């Protein structure tokens, strides 16, 4: 399948929920953290700044297995153990209204292809 490059016109969903033509402004790598909470539940999509026991933006990820504290979706702090750091290629897109999103490869379509 096709690689997508910066400056290409593509089709993707706007924040309102409908597909429009947009432009790829830049390619980015986003780094997600994976953790096992103390109750045994698992998260695969934490950001580095969500670790509140150490400064991961300045010093990089925890060691595999390391005890951490996490600021969660409810705004509370929970104990966890660090599992892994998972980098993903993403695509910053811009619509005619000036709005922007950062999205996964599977959310972008070429002008020539059938939707969805």
From Swiss-Prot:
Organ and tissue specificity: Ubiquitous.
Transmembrane segment boundaries: none
Site (Histone H3K4me3 binding): 50, 72, 78
PTM field: Ubiquitinated by RNF8 and RNF168 following DNA damage, leading to its degradation. Degradation promotes accessibility of H4K20me2 mark for DNA repair protein TP53BP1, which is then recruited. Also ubiquitinated by the SCF(FBXO22) complex; leading to proteasomal degradation.
Domain Tudor: 2-59, 60-116
Subcellular location: Nucleus
Stated consequence of mutating residue 44 to R: Impairs binding to H4K20me2, promoting partial recruitment of TP53BP1
Effect of residue 78 to A: Abolishes binding to H3K4me3
Stated consequence of mutating residue 50 to A: Impairs binding to H3K4me3
Protein function: Histone demethylase that specifically demethylates 'Lys-9' and 'Lys-36' residues of histone H3, thereby playing a central role in histone code. Does not demethylate histone H3 'Lys-4', H3 'Lys-27' nor H4 'Lys-20'. Demethylates trimethylated H3 'Lys-9' and H3 'Lys-36' residue, while it has no activity on mono- and dimethylated residues. Demethylation of Lys residue generates formaldehyde and succinate. Participates in transcriptional repression of ASCL2 and E2F-responsive promoters via the recruitment of histone deacetylases and NCOR1, respectively.
Family per similarity comment: Belongs to the JHDM3 histone demethylase family.
Notes on the domains: The 2 Tudor domains recognize and bind methylated histone H3 'Lys-4' residue (H3K4me). Double Tudor domain has an interdigitated structure and the unusual fold is required for its ability to bind methylated histone tails. Trimethylated H3 'Lys-4' (H3K4me3) is bound in a cage of 3 aromatic residues, 2 of which are from the Tudor domain 2, while the binding specificity is determined by side-chain interactions involving residues from the Tudor domain 1. The Tudor domains are also able to bind trimethylated histone H3 'Lys-9' (H3K9me3), di- and trimethylated H4 'Lys-20' (H4K20me2 and H4K20me3).
Subunit structure: Interacts with histone deacetylase proteins HDAC1, HDAC2 and HDAC3. Interacts with RB and NCOR1. Interacts with VRK1. Interacts with FBXO22; this interaction promotes KDM4A ubiquitination.
Record's protein name: Lysine-specific demethylase 4A
Organism for this UniProt entry: Homo sapiens (Human)
Gene coding for it: KDM4A
Residues of the full protein shown: 897 to 1011 of 1064
